Each structure stands twice: as structure tokens, then as C-alpha cells.
Short mmCIF file of C-alpha atoms and ligand atoms in Angstrom, two decimals:
data_model
loop_
_atom_site.label_atom_id
_atom_site.label_comp_id
_atom_site.label_asym_id
_atom_site.label_seq_id
_atom_site.Cartn_x
_atom_site.Cartn_y
_atom_site.Cartn_z
CA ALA A 1 -44.63 -220.91 279.81
CA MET A 2 -47.67 -218.69 280.36
CA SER A 3 -49.93 -221.57 279.35
CA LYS A 4 -48.13 -223.87 281.81
CA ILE A 5 -49.47 -224.80 285.26
CA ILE A 6 -47.13 -225.50 288.17
CA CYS A 7 -48.61 -227.31 291.19
CA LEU A 8 -46.82 -226.88 294.52
CA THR A 9 -47.93 -228.48 297.79
CA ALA A 10 -46.53 -229.05 301.28
CA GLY A 11 -46.36 -232.35 303.10
CA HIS A 12 -47.92 -232.88 306.49
CA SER A 13 -50.06 -230.70 308.77
CA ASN A 14 -50.26 -228.77 312.09
CA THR A 15 -51.69 -231.81 313.89
CA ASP A 16 -49.49 -234.44 312.14
CA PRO A 17 -46.29 -232.51 311.42
CA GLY A 18 -43.99 -235.21 309.99
CA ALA A 19 -40.42 -235.50 311.25
CA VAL A 20 -39.20 -233.18 314.01
CA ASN A 21 -35.74 -232.07 315.09
CA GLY A 22 -36.04 -229.96 318.22
CA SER A 23 -38.56 -227.22 317.49
CA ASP A 24 -37.97 -227.62 313.75
CA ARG A 25 -40.91 -229.46 312.18
CA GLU A 26 -41.16 -230.96 308.69
CA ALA A 27 -44.62 -229.44 308.26
CA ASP A 28 -43.24 -225.95 308.89
CA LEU A 29 -40.17 -226.38 306.65
CA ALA A 30 -42.42 -227.75 303.87
CA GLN A 31 -44.84 -224.79 304.24
CA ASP A 32 -41.87 -222.40 303.89
CA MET A 33 -40.56 -224.20 300.79
CA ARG A 34 -43.96 -224.24 299.05
CA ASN A 35 -44.76 -220.60 299.96
CA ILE A 36 -41.38 -219.15 298.99
CA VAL A 37 -41.04 -221.04 295.74
CA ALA A 38 -44.66 -220.18 294.82
CA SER A 39 -44.19 -216.49 295.63
CA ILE A 40 -41.04 -216.20 293.44
CA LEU A 41 -42.62 -218.03 290.49
CA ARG A 42 -45.60 -215.61 290.72
CA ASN A 43 -43.61 -212.37 291.48
CA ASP A 44 -40.50 -212.65 289.39
CA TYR A 45 -41.96 -214.60 286.48
CA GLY A 46 -45.75 -214.07 286.40
CA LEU A 47 -46.29 -217.84 286.19
CA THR A 48 -49.46 -219.77 287.07
CA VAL A 49 -49.04 -221.70 290.29
CA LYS A 50 -51.71 -223.77 291.98
CA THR A 51 -51.18 -224.71 295.60
CA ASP A 52 -52.78 -226.17 298.71
CA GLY A 53 -52.61 -222.59 300.14
CA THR A 54 -50.18 -220.68 302.36
CA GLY A 55 -50.91 -222.59 305.61
CA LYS A 56 -49.85 -226.13 306.49
CA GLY A 57 -50.11 -228.92 303.90
CA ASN A 58 -51.33 -232.54 303.61
CA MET A 59 -54.12 -231.86 301.09
CA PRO A 60 -56.29 -234.97 300.71
CA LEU A 61 -54.79 -237.38 298.17
CA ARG A 62 -57.98 -237.32 296.08
CA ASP A 63 -57.76 -233.54 295.81
CA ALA A 64 -53.99 -233.54 295.30
CA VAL A 65 -54.23 -236.04 292.46
CA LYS A 66 -56.81 -233.89 290.72
CA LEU A 67 -54.25 -231.02 290.86
CA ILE A 68 -51.43 -233.27 289.63
CA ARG A 69 -53.52 -234.29 286.64
CA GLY A 70 -54.32 -230.65 285.83
CA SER A 71 -50.66 -229.50 285.87
CA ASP A 72 -47.43 -229.70 283.84
CA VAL A 73 -45.21 -230.19 286.87
CA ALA A 74 -46.42 -230.99 290.42
CA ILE A 75 -44.11 -230.93 293.44
CA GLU A 76 -44.83 -231.72 297.09
CA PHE A 77 -42.14 -230.56 299.48
CA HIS A 78 -40.98 -232.89 302.26
CA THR A 79 -37.89 -233.47 304.37
CA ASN A 80 -36.08 -236.79 304.55
CA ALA A 81 -35.27 -238.36 307.92
CA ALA A 82 -33.14 -241.23 309.27
CA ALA A 83 -32.23 -242.60 312.67
CA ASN A 84 -28.67 -242.19 311.35
CA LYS A 85 -28.09 -238.48 311.95
CA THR A 86 -25.23 -238.45 309.44
CA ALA A 87 -27.53 -239.56 306.53
CA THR A 88 -27.45 -236.76 303.94
CA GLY A 89 -28.42 -235.74 300.42
CA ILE A 90 -31.11 -234.76 297.95
CA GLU A 91 -33.74 -236.86 296.33
CA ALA A 92 -37.03 -236.62 294.50
CA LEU A 93 -39.38 -239.57 294.08
CA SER A 94 -41.60 -239.79 291.02
CA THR A 95 -42.53 -241.77 287.92
CA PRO A 96 -39.88 -242.06 285.20
CA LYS A 97 -41.82 -239.52 283.15
CA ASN A 98 -40.66 -236.94 285.70
CA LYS A 99 -36.95 -238.00 285.90
CA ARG A 100 -35.73 -234.89 284.10
CA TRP A 101 -37.81 -232.64 286.34
CA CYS A 102 -36.46 -234.43 289.46
CA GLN A 103 -32.93 -233.89 288.15
CA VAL A 104 -33.54 -230.17 287.37
CA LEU A 105 -34.87 -229.64 290.93
CA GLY A 106 -32.11 -231.66 292.58
CA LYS A 107 -29.28 -229.98 290.72
CA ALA A 108 -30.63 -226.54 291.54
CA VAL A 109 -30.42 -227.37 295.26
CA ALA A 110 -27.03 -229.14 295.01
CA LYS A 111 -25.39 -226.11 293.31
CA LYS A 112 -26.46 -223.85 296.19
CA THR A 113 -25.59 -226.25 299.03
CA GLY A 114 -22.88 -228.75 298.12
CA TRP A 115 -25.35 -231.48 299.20
CA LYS A 116 -25.00 -234.88 297.55
CA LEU A 117 -27.46 -235.91 294.80
CA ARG A 118 -28.85 -239.34 295.77
CA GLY A 119 -30.27 -241.74 293.16
CA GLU A 120 -29.74 -240.81 289.53
CA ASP A 121 -28.68 -237.18 289.88
CA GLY A 122 -31.49 -236.77 292.42
CA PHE A 123 -34.16 -239.06 290.94
CA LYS A 124 -35.59 -242.14 292.61
CA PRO A 125 -38.40 -244.08 290.91
CA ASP A 126 -41.80 -244.70 292.43
CA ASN A 127 -41.66 -248.48 291.78
CA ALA A 128 -38.96 -248.81 294.44
CA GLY A 129 -40.22 -246.07 296.79
CA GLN A 130 -41.28 -246.15 300.44
CA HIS A 131 -43.13 -242.98 301.50
CA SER A 132 -46.27 -241.66 303.29
CA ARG A 133 -47.14 -239.85 300.04
CA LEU A 134 -45.86 -242.52 297.62
CA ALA A 135 -49.40 -242.31 296.14
CA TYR A 136 -48.61 -238.68 295.10
CA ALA A 137 -45.46 -239.89 293.33
CA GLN A 138 -47.34 -242.84 291.75
CA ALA A 139 -49.97 -240.42 290.43
CA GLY A 140 -47.25 -238.46 288.59
CA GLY A 141 -46.43 -235.84 291.20
CA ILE A 142 -42.88 -235.36 292.54
CA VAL A 143 -42.17 -235.93 296.24
CA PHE A 144 -39.15 -233.65 296.72
CA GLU A 145 -36.88 -234.21 299.72
CA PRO A 146 -34.04 -231.75 299.42
CA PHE A 147 -32.44 -232.67 302.78
CA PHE A 148 -32.64 -234.79 305.92
CA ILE A 149 -34.20 -232.90 308.80
CA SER A 150 -32.31 -235.37 310.98
CA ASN A 151 -28.97 -234.03 309.70
CA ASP A 152 -28.21 -231.18 312.11
CA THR A 153 -25.51 -229.61 309.87
CA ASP A 154 -27.61 -229.73 306.66
CA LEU A 155 -30.64 -228.42 308.56
CA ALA A 156 -28.56 -225.47 309.86
CA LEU A 157 -27.47 -224.70 306.28
CA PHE A 158 -31.07 -224.84 305.10
CA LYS A 159 -32.25 -222.54 307.89
CA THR A 160 -29.55 -219.89 307.12
CA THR A 161 -30.01 -220.04 303.29
CA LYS A 162 -33.72 -220.91 302.97
CA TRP A 163 -34.69 -218.00 300.75
CA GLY A 164 -31.69 -218.50 298.49
CA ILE A 165 -32.30 -222.25 298.18
CA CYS A 166 -36.02 -221.70 297.36
CA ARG A 167 -35.05 -218.96 294.85
CA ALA A 168 -32.64 -221.46 293.17
CA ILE A 169 -35.56 -223.93 292.93
CA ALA A 170 -37.97 -221.32 291.50
CA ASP A 171 -35.35 -220.05 289.02
CA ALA A 172 -34.64 -223.62 287.81
CA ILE A 173 -38.36 -224.31 287.27
CA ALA A 174 -38.75 -221.08 285.29
CA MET A 175 -35.63 -221.81 283.23
CA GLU A 176 -36.82 -225.33 282.35
CA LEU A 177 -40.15 -223.85 281.21
CA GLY A 178 -38.28 -221.14 279.25
CA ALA A 179 -39.90 -218.33 281.27
CA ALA A 180 -37.99 -215.09 281.39
CA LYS A 181 -38.17 -212.76 284.39
CA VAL A 182 -40.88 -210.05 284.21
CA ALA B 1 -54.49 -196.67 302.41
CA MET B 2 -53.56 -196.84 298.70
CA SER B 3 -51.51 -193.66 298.65
CA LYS B 4 -49.58 -194.51 301.84
CA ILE B 5 -46.05 -195.96 301.96
CA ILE B 6 -44.77 -198.60 304.38
CA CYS B 7 -41.12 -199.21 305.08
CA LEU B 8 -40.02 -202.67 306.30
CA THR B 9 -36.46 -203.70 306.95
CA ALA B 10 -34.64 -206.50 308.83
CA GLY B 11 -31.99 -206.36 311.48
CA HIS B 12 -28.48 -207.83 311.08
CA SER B 13 -26.64 -209.59 308.31
CA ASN B 14 -25.51 -213.01 307.19
CA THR B 15 -22.02 -212.75 308.67
CA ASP B 16 -23.02 -210.58 311.68
CA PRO B 17 -26.40 -212.22 312.42
CA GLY B 18 -27.38 -210.89 315.83
CA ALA B 19 -28.58 -213.15 318.61
CA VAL B 20 -28.59 -216.91 318.03
CA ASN B 21 -30.32 -219.86 319.64
CA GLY B 22 -28.83 -223.07 318.33
CA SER B 23 -29.17 -222.93 314.57
CA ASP B 24 -31.86 -220.27 314.75
CA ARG B 25 -30.41 -216.80 314.05
CA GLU B 26 -31.91 -213.36 314.53
CA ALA B 27 -30.94 -212.28 310.97
CA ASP B 28 -32.86 -215.20 309.50
CA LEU B 29 -35.98 -214.73 311.65
CA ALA B 30 -35.91 -210.96 310.90
CA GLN B 31 -35.68 -211.77 307.17
CA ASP B 32 -38.72 -214.06 307.49
CA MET B 33 -40.73 -211.37 309.35
CA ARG B 34 -39.84 -208.61 306.88
CA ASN B 35 -40.46 -210.78 303.78
CA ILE B 36 -43.74 -212.34 304.99
CA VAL B 37 -45.26 -209.10 306.25
CA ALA B 38 -44.15 -207.28 303.07
CA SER B 39 -45.66 -209.98 300.86
CA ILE B 40 -49.00 -209.84 302.70
CA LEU B 41 -49.18 -206.03 302.52
CA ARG B 42 -48.28 -206.11 298.82
CA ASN B 43 -50.15 -209.21 297.62
CA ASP B 44 -53.22 -209.20 299.85
CA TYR B 45 -53.64 -205.48 300.53
CA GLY B 46 -52.15 -203.99 297.38
CA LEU B 47 -50.16 -201.48 299.43
CA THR B 48 -46.86 -199.84 298.54
CA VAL B 49 -43.92 -201.15 300.58
CA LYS B 50 -40.28 -199.99 300.50
CA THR B 51 -37.69 -202.50 301.84
CA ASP B 52 -34.03 -203.41 302.16
CA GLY B 53 -34.74 -206.40 299.86
CA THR B 54 -35.59 -210.07 300.33
CA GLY B 55 -32.15 -211.01 301.61
CA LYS B 56 -30.53 -210.31 304.94
CA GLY B 57 -30.76 -206.85 306.49
CA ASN B 58 -28.60 -204.19 308.18
CA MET B 59 -29.15 -201.53 305.53
CA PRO B 60 -26.83 -198.61 306.30
CA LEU B 61 -28.40 -195.92 308.47
CA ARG B 62 -28.00 -193.19 305.85
CA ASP B 63 -30.01 -195.29 303.45
CA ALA B 64 -32.51 -196.57 306.02
CA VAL B 65 -33.38 -193.09 307.25
CA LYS B 66 -34.17 -191.98 303.69
CA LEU B 67 -36.79 -194.75 303.64
CA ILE B 68 -38.06 -193.85 307.13
CA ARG B 69 -38.46 -190.21 306.15
CA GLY B 70 -40.23 -191.26 302.93
CA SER B 71 -42.78 -193.56 304.57
CA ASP B 72 -45.90 -193.25 306.76
CA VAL B 73 -44.69 -196.04 309.01
CA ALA B 74 -41.27 -197.80 309.15
CA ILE B 75 -40.53 -201.01 311.00
CA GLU B 76 -37.27 -202.97 311.37
CA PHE B 77 -37.74 -206.50 312.63
CA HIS B 78 -35.40 -207.71 315.42
CA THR B 79 -35.51 -210.38 318.14
CA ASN B 80 -34.86 -209.62 321.83
CA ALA B 81 -32.34 -211.65 323.86
CA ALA B 82 -31.31 -212.12 327.47
CA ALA B 83 -28.94 -214.19 329.61
CA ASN B 84 -32.11 -215.19 331.45
CA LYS B 85 -33.50 -217.78 329.03
CA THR B 86 -37.04 -217.36 330.42
CA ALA B 87 -37.18 -213.63 329.77
CA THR B 88 -40.26 -213.07 327.61
CA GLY B 89 -42.45 -210.51 325.92
CA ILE B 90 -43.07 -207.96 323.15
CA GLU B 91 -41.54 -204.54 322.72
CA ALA B 92 -41.31 -201.88 320.04
CA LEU B 93 -38.78 -199.04 320.38
CA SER B 94 -39.42 -195.66 318.78
CA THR B 95 -39.72 -191.96 319.51
CA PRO B 96 -42.44 -190.88 321.99
CA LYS B 97 -44.10 -189.12 319.14
CA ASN B 98 -44.51 -192.58 317.54
CA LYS B 99 -46.00 -194.42 320.61
CA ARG B 100 -49.40 -195.20 319.08
CA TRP B 101 -47.91 -197.19 316.18
CA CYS B 102 -45.73 -199.23 318.59
CA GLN B 103 -48.77 -200.07 320.68
CA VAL B 104 -50.84 -201.01 317.61
CA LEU B 105 -48.16 -203.49 316.53
CA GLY B 106 -47.53 -204.92 319.98
CA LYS B 107 -51.17 -205.39 320.88
CA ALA B 108 -51.77 -207.12 317.54
CA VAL B 109 -49.00 -209.64 318.30
CA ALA B 110 -50.17 -210.10 321.94
CA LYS B 111 -53.73 -210.86 320.77
CA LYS B 112 -52.43 -213.47 318.33
CA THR B 113 -49.88 -215.25 320.49
CA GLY B 114 -50.74 -214.70 324.15
CA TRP B 115 -47.32 -213.11 324.68
CA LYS B 116 -46.91 -210.42 327.35
CA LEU B 117 -46.56 -206.77 326.48
CA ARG B 118 -43.42 -205.14 327.85
CA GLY B 119 -43.04 -201.38 328.39
CA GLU B 120 -46.27 -199.34 327.90
CA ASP B 121 -48.46 -201.78 325.92
CA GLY B 122 -45.29 -202.72 323.99
CA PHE B 123 -43.79 -199.26 323.65
CA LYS B 124 -40.38 -198.25 324.87
CA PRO B 125 -38.81 -194.86 324.12
CA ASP B 126 -35.67 -194.25 322.07
CA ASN B 127 -34.38 -191.82 324.72
CA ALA B 128 -33.72 -194.57 327.30
CA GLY B 129 -32.67 -197.13 324.70
CA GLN B 130 -29.78 -199.61 324.43
CA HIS B 131 -29.79 -201.21 320.99
CA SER B 132 -27.57 -201.81 317.99
CA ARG B 133 -30.09 -200.03 315.79
CA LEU B 134 -31.13 -197.47 318.36
CA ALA B 135 -30.53 -194.88 315.61
CA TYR B 136 -33.35 -196.43 313.53
CA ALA B 137 -35.77 -195.77 316.43
CA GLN B 138 -34.21 -192.31 317.02
CA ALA B 139 -35.12 -191.38 313.44
CA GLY B 140 -38.73 -192.29 314.12
CA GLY B 141 -38.62 -195.78 312.70
CA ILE B 142 -39.84 -198.62 314.91
CA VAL B 143 -37.39 -201.30 316.09
CA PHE B 144 -39.88 -204.14 316.66
CA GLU B 145 -38.90 -207.11 318.86
CA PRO B 146 -41.96 -209.31 319.10
CA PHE B 147 -40.14 -212.05 321.04
CA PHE B 148 -36.94 -213.20 322.71
CA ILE B 149 -34.92 -215.58 320.49
CA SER B 150 -33.28 -216.74 323.73
CA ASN B 151 -36.66 -218.04 324.97
CA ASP B 152 -37.00 -221.59 323.63
CA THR B 153 -40.77 -221.72 324.17
CA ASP B 154 -41.53 -218.35 322.48
CA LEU B 155 -39.10 -219.11 319.61
CA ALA B 156 -40.86 -222.44 319.06
CA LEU B 157 -44.24 -220.66 318.94
CA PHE B 158 -42.91 -218.22 316.39
CA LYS B 159 -41.54 -221.07 314.29
CA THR B 160 -44.86 -222.96 314.28
CA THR B 161 -47.18 -219.98 313.85
CA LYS B 162 -45.09 -217.40 312.03
CA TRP B 163 -47.32 -217.08 308.99
CA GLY B 164 -50.26 -216.27 311.32
CA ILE B 165 -48.19 -213.89 313.46
CA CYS B 166 -46.95 -212.05 310.36
CA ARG B 167 -50.50 -211.86 308.95
CA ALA B 168 -51.62 -210.38 312.30
CA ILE B 169 -48.92 -207.76 311.95
CA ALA B 170 -49.78 -206.99 308.30
CA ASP B 171 -53.50 -206.70 309.14
CA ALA B 172 -52.76 -204.29 312.03
CA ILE B 173 -50.59 -202.08 309.74
CA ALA B 174 -53.15 -202.08 306.91
CA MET B 175 -56.09 -201.28 309.17
CA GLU B 176 -54.26 -198.47 311.04
CA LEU B 177 -53.50 -196.95 307.61
CA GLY B 178 -57.19 -196.96 306.60
CA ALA B 179 -57.50 -200.25 304.71
CA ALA B 180 -60.30 -202.75 305.16
CA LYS B 181 -59.18 -206.05 306.70
CA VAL B 182 -58.68 -208.86 304.16
ZN1 ZN C 1 -42.69 -236.26 304.75
ZN1 ZN C 2 -31.20 -207.09 316.93
#
């Protein structure tokens, strides 16, 4: 696990913040997910994590893809959104190579939240995907959408259990890599 | 600053979360402040920080005061609240003896955000106080309330710039303790 490289990035930016629900912005939620998961992987496990920093995300695709290629797992955090404010659940978009990783991530979040796993236990393939960062998924990264920002109830749960959810994600990544806590 | 000790805690708990504004809760914002500032002081400045953990707060007073007494500076993060939803500004409650630290913190946040300083450049004394954790300030800790959760505009600013606000706080603490800015 100490030879492994985990890439974590955040979708969207301060100027183009993705989906919004009130004063909650996708860009901000994605920044929190990337930062918290990164910090736990580094602190609790001493693992190598490469990121697009601690600020907002939306690293240029060219640069992102270079990071994807240099890593063992690469995850960009996003929130889902629908006009239907009852739409709910967890999904991760990637190539079939990454199905197991998508399922590990999705299950980690489902256990903590009771949210529904969409797709195949949280996996949706790139060949059928529609996304602003579909190119990231096509390149072998994972576009992870743990919840719909448009779902007020799920968003409230996320906001009240953010650190616990992100710890579940970090712990699941470490477990899959066989990394013990340090 | 390498031999100094900082204490950081958070107000309120998961099931008694303090003031709320929609699905934003004081306990959760306080947890973010405490965790982000602590992580910057530890990871960027290499300083020694004592905390009530990475979860929710409301460490018992007997325990909290042990940390206050064993630190060079001790801050519990809270949010202010009012019936008047346009009430605004920064305050830090502590003993008179501890005025300078309160003003350092408040002015740092004012510079970053443009928020108004309440009291004397952010300081308010423990001897005229009304607060659930007044006893934390009475012991010479600092009950820090950088903004009113009840103010939609200021809460939104916190939400969109929190990592910068928390870095401004961490920088102010480090520099006052003798460390070079990072
Ligand atoms: Zn997105
Ligand atoms: Zn409070």
C-alpha cells in the first residue's frame, strides 16, 4: 500500500461552482470531500495521495488525466442533481476496470447513510454516461457522486455527518489497499 | 513556537447542536472550524495542538479546563445567533487578562472577510457574559464566535470561503506564538 498512489480531486470551481441548493454549492461540498478524505488517508494511514490542492477543484482535464495515469485509483468528487427533488442515491461513473473500486466506494457510503446504491451496487459505466467530466471517467478516473445535492433530506444528512461519511470513504480505500492504520 | 501548545475545541454536540439555520447547524460549523484550523496548525506549521477530537464537541468543563490550563492559548469555536436575522459581526469572549488574544483572532477574521468587529476590536469580557459555555471563557479560554449562523449572508460567506477563513485564523495563532507565516 505504501507503493500505491491515490489521486483525489474535486469537481468544479469558485467561478463555475456546479449545482447549487440555497447557499450549498457543489464546488464547496466537493472541496470538503476531497480535503477530508485526503487528510485521513495521510494522517491515519500514511498513504501517498496526490490532489488538485486544498482549494476549489476543476483541474484542467489534460493535467487531471496525467494524474489519473500516474495513480492506482483516481477519484473526483461531485454531487448529483435532478429537477426531481426526490431523486436519490449513490453512483460512481468509470470504466469497467474500476467497477470494483466504484462498488467499494459506494458501499462505504451506503453503510453510513442508508442511501440507495444506483447502478450495479454503485457502478455506472462510462460508455452510457452523461457528465461534464465524462472525459475523466473515460480516461480511467472515477467520477463519484455520493448524493443528489437537489435532495434536501439527503443533503441535510450529508451536512450533519460529513466527517463520518468521508472517514468511511477513506477507511474503505485503505482497507481495499490492505493498509493498516499507523 | 515549537514548544508552545494550542488548545482547540468545538461547541455543542450532535444531539444538542446549538443554533441552526435550515440544515446548517452550529455543532457542524464548529467542528469544521476546529478541525480545519487544527489541521493547518499541525500540518502546515508543525505545532502541537490539543483538541476534543475530530467529531462533535461539548467536552465536559472539567476536562476542557485541564486543556485550557495546559495550553498557551485555548479557543472553542461557536456561532452567534439572534432573533434579528441581520445581526452581524465577530466576537471573542474571554477574561480581561486575555483581551489581546481575542483581538488578534477577531482582527484576523475581519481582515479576511470584511465582517464587522463587535465589542472592543472583537473582545467581550467573561464578567458581563451570557453564554452556554461562559465557563470556558471564565477559565481563560476563548469562546470565539466569528459570525452569526442566523445571518444568511454571513453564513453563506463562511460556507464559500471557510478554508480561507480558517487559514487566516491558523496564521494569526501561529504568528502570535512566534512562528513565521507559511
Ligand atoms: Zn459535477
Ligand atoms: Zn454556541
